[PDB]
Every structure is written in structure tokens, then in C-alpha cells.
Design a protein around this ligand. Sequence first.
Ligand code: NA
Length: 321
Amino acid sequence: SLRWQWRIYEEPLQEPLTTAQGVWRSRSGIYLRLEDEQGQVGYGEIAPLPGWGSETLNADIALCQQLPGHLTPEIMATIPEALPAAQFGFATAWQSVGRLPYRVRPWPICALLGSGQAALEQWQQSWQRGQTTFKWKVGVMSPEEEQAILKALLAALPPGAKLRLDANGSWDRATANRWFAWLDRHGNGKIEYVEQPLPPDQWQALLSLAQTVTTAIALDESVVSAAEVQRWVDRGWPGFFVIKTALFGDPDSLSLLLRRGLEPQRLVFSSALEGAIARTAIFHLLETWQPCHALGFGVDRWRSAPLLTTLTAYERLWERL
Ligand code: NA
């Protein structure tokens, strides 16, 4: 066994984040610190994202208060499947004990483009800093206005650019269908996928669209936990899955899915606006999974979380609390 402690954090965003569901001003979570008898230390982070699945930080806190003062693999196996961010935090903390700091690498990162005409002026600085895959928010203006911008954006992007269109579940079914018909006529080798064209409740239409239209579709809001990923694999989802590792469960569950029916080439790993402990843990896991698409970690505007390169850096973060 080994000893451990946990601390809540509540960190203001670097700037506010507006979504269709309201303005975000801070992120909260839990940091875990594990120490063995000798003095080796490991760290993990539990940060469920409000609105994304059923797990709440309050439920993770209750879990932390219910666990024994000494952890073992069998104790950690008692963590409910309904708390996948807690599963991620404890599993990554355990695996880090006496293994920090981790070897990590730059992976390509997807650059964001803001809704509307902004996209046409925001790709250049990112391109000039070596980002070649972009994600642009759609479903904000009328379809016809966005299609006109899209036509100009595709003409302007340099050779080799890739573009993701993120609807965030904001289209109704007839609108999605009209968009996919437009993309069949006017789309381009630069379009990688449409992300979450319909809200998660419209799963039958999402599946039918993916099975019939010519442009790839990615699930995002639909796939938070390992259980949701498995449900979509078993439905025969032919598109992409955007995996938020910090929210998903024990990382070993993704590897198990991959050994089974999930295709590595259909994964895109993205950020849940987590902190440096979780992000560094995810980059360590990427040394095994070896991603083949630009990561959805271009989120520094809202939450900057530089990877941790020294054990003292973890200790500073912890003591700062
Ligand atoms: Na999305």
C-alpha cells in the first residue's frame, strides 16, 4: 500500500469561455499526491467537466473522503465506473509513483478558428508557428453565411492544410442534412470531419448520417466515458471519436477497446481544460498510443497548462495550494 492526500483547486480561466450553454470563468478539480514508504511521490488530477456526462466534482470529493488512508490496486478497483475522471486520476497517480518526471514529446496540435468571418484572419499566425490542422466553430451563423466563409477559407488555406468543422451539436436534423449535401458538392480534401453535427440525444440520426454521407463525422459530446465509447463501437460507428482522456476512465480501458474493435486511426485526443498534472499524464500515455491526428490541446487561451518537466515542479504546484 502507500499513503495519499487530495486537495481541491479552483483556477480562474486565462480569459472567459463562451459556449451556447453560458460563459465559463474558472475550472475546479482535485489534485492527488501519493507517497510510498521510501519517499517516492506520484501525482494525479481529477477534473470532470460540468455538463459532460453525469460525474460531478462533488461526487469525486465524496469518493476521496470514503477511500481508506492507504491505497492498493484492489482498493482502487472499488472506484465506481460512474466516476471516470476519478478512475483516471487515481490510475495515473498510481502509475506515476517513482516514475516522475515523464518523457514526453511535442505532438502536432490543432489550432482553433473562431466562429464567423474571424476564421479568415486567424489561421495565418497559427500556420506560421507550424500548426497545419484547424478546427472552426460552425452552427453559429446561418448555414449560407458559414458556407460562404467556408468557401473562402478553403481557397485561402495553404496546400497541406486540414480543417475540422465543429457544430457542437447545434444543428437540427434537416440543417445537418443540407450541410452534408453542400459538403458533398463543395467540399474538399482539406475537410477532415464534421464534429458532433447533432446533439447526443439524436443518436439514431447521427448514426444514419455517418453511414450515408460522404464526409466523415466525429463524436465529441457523445463520447465522454469509456462506456459511451464502447456503446458507439458496438453500434458500428464508422467515424471518428474525440477522446478526452482526463474524463474517460482508467486509461487501460482505452487500450482494451483498441485491442478489441476500436480503430486507433479513428481517435483524436483532446483537452477537457484540465491542468498540468492531467495534461502531462496524458502526454505520457501518448508515448504508448502514438496519436496520428493533431491533438485538441490548442486551448491555451482559456487554460494554459505547460507540461511538467521536473519533480520539483509538481511539488511547487502542490504546495502552492
Ligand atoms: Na463538438
